[PDB]
């Protein structure tokens, strides 16, 4: 589905360079239950547009307005808005957290790091989600080992 795979130095703000495996990109094929897939789509569109078209602000804005639905999940954006509205921890598209295998690099789909009152949620607030994702990922891993 790539218009131009894992991230590079300039896309990551904190570390020098980190990137993912094939399972995440293979799962983000029109996937709109997750925000990381939308981020990957945005980055891919930017990379493909910069390497094929000369710089132009008006034309880029026009093409974004025409194909905004093809990149950003509308309903995820509006739900995250609604969460921000009612004093509820929401996703502001900055920080994503995931679990990866120590050796084979088997990564999962990064969940968004919720933010509330202008501050990221503590690790102990969503530990249950981390445990559930670890469990389902280990079940998927054993199923893939069996086949």
């Amino acid at each position: 589905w790539t218009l131009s795979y894992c991230l590079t130095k300039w896309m990551i703000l904190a570390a020098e360079l980190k990137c993912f495996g094939n399972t995440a990109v293979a799962k983000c094929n029109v996937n709109h239950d997750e925000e990381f897939c939308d981020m990957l789509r945005l980055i891919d569109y930017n990379k493909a547009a910069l390497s094929k078209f000369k710089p132009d602000v008006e034309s880029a804005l026009h093409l974004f307005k025409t194909t905004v639905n093809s990149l950003i999940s509308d309903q995820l954006l509006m739900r995250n808005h609604l969460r921000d509205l009612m004093c509820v921890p929401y996703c502001n598209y900055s920080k994503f957290w995931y679990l990866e295998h120590a050796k084979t690099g088997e990564t999962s789909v990064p969940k968004c790091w919720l933010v509330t009152n202008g501050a990221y949620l503590n690790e102990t607030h969503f530990s249950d989600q981390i445990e559930q994702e670890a469990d389902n990922m280990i079940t998927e891993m054993l199923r893939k080992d069996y086949i």
Binding site: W10, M11, I12, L13, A14, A15, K18, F36, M39, L42, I43, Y45, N46, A49, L50, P55, V57, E58, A60, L61, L63, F64, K65, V68, I72, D74, L77, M78, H81, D84, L85, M86, C87, N92, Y93, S94, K95, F96, W97, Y98, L99, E100, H101, A102, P110, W113, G118, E123, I130, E131, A134, M137, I138
Partner: protein, 170 residues
């Protein structure tokens, strides 16, 4: 580390490179807000002083004009035709008057805060015991001008502009 096998770590995204192809919508602080597309920018300042007193303007680069038209059309209902002042000469400068002529939402202030709100999120100027729907403000002016982007805030992304695009003429 979790379960003794997998390791917990986070990703942090930088939106500085998502500039030449995508709009960016942010706030430096409670006062100032910015909308930057490429090398072009719009500054939304919540001054408590007015600079224009025309109270009459005719809507008659293209990028900033399209962003401004999206923002204006995203104020829904009737703009009362007497609370907006315009200066499209030698730059774009639009001033909203944002004053009362306990609902606090049925007025023009309520809807203008609703459009600012829906463009920039609810981190600033938000309330929150039951709190009214529309956002609350202590200023009485909103000036949107053009400013040549100089990396004033931290880049956010086109998500606010997408919310503006979806919530247009409803």
């Amino acid at each position: 580390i979790y379960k003794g096998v997998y390791q917990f770590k986070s990703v942090e995204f930088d939106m500085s490179h998502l500039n030449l192809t995508m709009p960016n919508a942010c706030s430096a602080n409670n006062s100032h807000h910015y909308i930057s597309m490429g090398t072009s920018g719009l500054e939304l300042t919540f001054t408590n002083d007015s600079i224009i007193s025309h109270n009459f303007c005719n809507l008659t680069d293209h990028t900033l004009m399209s962003i401004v038209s999206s923002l204006h059309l995203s104020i829904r209902g009737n703009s009362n035709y007497k609370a907006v002042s315009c200066d499209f000469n030698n730059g774009i400068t639009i001033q909203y008057n944002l004053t009362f002529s306990q609902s606090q939402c049925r007025t023009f202030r309520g809807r203008v805060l609703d459009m600012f709100r829906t463009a920039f999120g609810g981190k600033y100027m938000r309330s929150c015991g039951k709190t009214t729907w529309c956002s609350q403000t202590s200023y009485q002016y909103l000036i949107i001008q053009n400013r040549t982007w100089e990396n004033h805030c931290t880049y956010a992304g086109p998500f606010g502009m997408s919310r503006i695009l979806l919530s247009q003429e409803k």
